Design a protein around this ligand. Structure first.
Ligand SMILES: CC(C)(COP(=O)(O)OP(=O)(O)OC[C@H]1O[C@@H](n2cnc3c(N)ncnc32)[C@H](O)[C@@H]1OP(=O)(O)O)[C@@H](O)C(=O)NCCC(=O)NCCS
Ligand SMILES: CC(C)(COP(=O)(O)OP(=O)(O)OC[C@H]1O[C@@H](n2cnc3c(N)ncnc32)[C@H](O)[C@@H]1OP(=O)(O)O)[C@@H](O)C(=O)NCCC(=O)NCCS
Ligand SMILES: CC(C)(COP(=O)(O)OP(=O)(O)OC[C@H]1O[C@@H](n2cnc3c(N)ncnc32)[C@H](O)[C@@H]1OP(=O)(O)O)[C@@H](O)C(=O)NCCC(=O)NCCS
Ligand SMILES: CC(=O)N[C@H]1[C@@H](OP(=O)(O)OP(=O)(O)OC[C@H]2O[C@@H](n3ccc(=O)[nH]c3=O)[C@H](O)[C@@H]2O)O[C@H](C(=O)O)[C@@H](O)[C@@H]1N
Ligand SMILES: CC(=O)N[C@H]1[C@@H](OP(=O)(O)OP(=O)(O)OC[C@H]2O[C@@H](n3ccc(=O)[nH]c3=O)[C@H](O)[C@@H]2O)O[C@H](C(=O)O)[C@@H](O)[C@@H]1N
Ligand code: NA
Lengths: 183, 179, 182
């Protein structure tokens, strides 16, 4: 049953599952920051069980679907989740991470402090986005990869992230198959 | 102040702030608290003035001035976590994306669009219909031109920005060539 | 005697000394953003006299020690101070400065808007970190130095900072020797 800090600001209609932590001063389900839609809330937010949202996190209502946070996610101070974002399971957003509209973040991705993701981007499984990395609209974000810089570029594979997941070269090759066949 | 402004009850608005009609102030905004200037803090000799039609969506901070009211123009849109320092002047129809940071005395002209997490050095001027890209760092020396796109750390011009007319553009260009 | 805005959210246990300003909507002493510890608070936060925290600043409780803010610091809107950070005296954090876990910031350092400091880094005396600078784990920060960019690189010596401080040549040699040993 959700532990919602009294100072958290939760819009009518937001779905918060059991075993969700919502910390002080979060703003959840307020209108999408889309000038065609604001201040209407056509959709809301859905936060799934085991997710911890520590404080001052903003997660906007969707325009075409519920903004979605998967199981066992960890969102740290001042993170910004725009309208229609879909976050998978076991995702970490560090402090002041910024996800633009319609961004998808896949299973186990780790987004470092103050990284910034262009609207409509896709961060694939077990990616590590470095502090302050700027993911521009056309960048191809490969699974299991580390991205750094302005603009963001691949510097290697996320070995650290792979180990912790405890996942085989089978379930990894499979994720590559999903990435490769995505178009 | 006797108008249809909608202010979320969690917004923290200093006494003396001027809020015009059709304004939206979202949750946990902090408006009109003392300028972050060690020579003045915690005094509030000036305040903040938000003009009609401006939407400030949540978690936005706009500090009171040191030498003038901090000033937000008509029909602006300020998104989550934006920071507006003392003595900033924003013109009409400006967009600040999430976590945009405007240093002290920054001026932002008509129609400027500032992308997520860009940072503008104190005393800079962002000219008419400029596009500042996400995460761009605008340093003190950069000479911003009207209608231009800036990206990067540090910020550099990369282009001109995509229904004003040639007579209106010439009048802007005129203001710029004299300053 | 600490002046604490009614909207500031202060965890049970937080130590706030006299002549401290805590502005609107600060979150101080909430659990460390460490998945091994959260939501436990094994330690807290200690803010020392003279410090001004202007608004919307987050300072998390420690995992291995009290998160510590020294005397006469100035922390501006939206600054993020992670678990186990130790900030010395007369430090300035501009708006949206991010200090990762266990970061140490020494005497008179000045961190510019939205700069980002990797966990376990050390920012030495009277350093200037420029707006948006990304301090990565391998950067050997040196006292009195100016760092800018993504990633951060040394660009010069913080003469403005040294001059303001009024620190003489004797004091600078002691800091320089403290660095040469550690
Ligand atoms: C991206 C990251 C994982 C890389 O760490 P690493 O693999 O140990 O990398 P290194 O520090 O050895 O640096 C490797 C190279 O990448 C660069 N680099 C590393 N992190 C960078 C970053 N965030 N931005 C830009 N460049 C970066 C280094 O400058 C170096 O460049 P070089 O090849 O010219 O020497 C790390 O720097 C990072 O950003 N982690 C996130 C920290 C964070 O968000 N902490 C919050 C915890 S809650
Ligand atoms: C600045 C911006 C408008 C440029 O758009 P664009 O011209 O379509 O840019 P593209 O991604 O097609 O590529 C332009 C070039 O500049 C680079 N670039 C674009 N935006 C950049 C940014 N923010 N930082 C760094 N480099 C950037 C690209 O890498 C590319 O470099 P290259 O051509 O040398 O390979 C856009 O990228 C941007 O930053 N928009 C902000 C997004 C935002 O804030 N959304 C929130 C909505 S509320
Ligand atoms: C870092 C800083 C102190 C350097 O200022 P400065 O010494 O006057 O430097 P200049 O503006 O003369 O620029 C020198 C070089 O550094 C670069 N530079 C300066 N600041 C930079 C920054 N923040 N990021 C990247 N590059 C930067 C310039 O591009 C220039 O490069 P070039 O030699 O290739 O042309 C300043 O730019 C800064 O970032 N200050 C922090 C601002 C702030 O947070 N204010 C809030 C007030 S509370
Ligand atoms: C906390 C506080 O008082 N802040 C105010 C104050 O900032 P400021 O201390 O940076 O002084 P400035 O004279 O602008 O610095 C000039 C240059 O030197 C750089 N600078 C500064 C300090 C330092 O130690 N090192 C350094 O390199 C600096 O980065 C810059 O590039 O003055 C700003 C201003 O009037 O525009 C206000 O917007 C601020 N609210
Ligand atoms: C969410 C959480 O628990 N956070 C805490 C935790 O961080 P952390 O999970 O990043 O582990 P670390 O041992 O610092 O990673 C080492 C390096 O690998 C990088 N790293 C990390 C994960 C990944 O998948 N890939 C990767 O490259 C990583 O970016 C870094 O460059 O531990 C930190 C700490 O002990 O000081 C705390 O400050 C944090 N608040
Ligand atoms: Na609040």
């Amino acid at each position: 049953n959700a532990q919602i800090h009294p100072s958290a600001v939760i819009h009518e209609g937001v779905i918060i599952e059991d075993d969700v932590y919502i910390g002080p001063n979060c703003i959840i389900g307020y209108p999408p920051e889309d000038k065609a839609v604001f201040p209407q809330t056509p959709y809301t937010v859905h936060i799934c069980s085991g997710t911890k949202i520590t404080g001052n996190v903003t997660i906007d209502a969707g325009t075409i679907k519920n903004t979605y946070i998967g199981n066992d996610c960890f969102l740290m101070k001042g993170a910004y989740v725009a309208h229609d974002v879909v976050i998978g399971n076991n995702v970490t957003l560090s402090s002041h991470v910024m996800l633009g509209g319609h961004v998808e973040v896949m299973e186990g991705a780790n987004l470092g402090m103050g990284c910034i993701i262009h609207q409509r981007q896709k961060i694939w499984h077990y990616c590590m986005i470095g502090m302050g990395a700027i993911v521009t609209k056309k960048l191809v974000i490969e699974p299991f990869s580390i991205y750094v810089g302005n603009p963001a570029k691949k510097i290697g594979t996320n070995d650290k992230g792979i180990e912790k997941s405890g996942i085989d070269e089978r379930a990894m090759a499979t994720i590559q198959e999903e990435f490769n066949a995505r178009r």
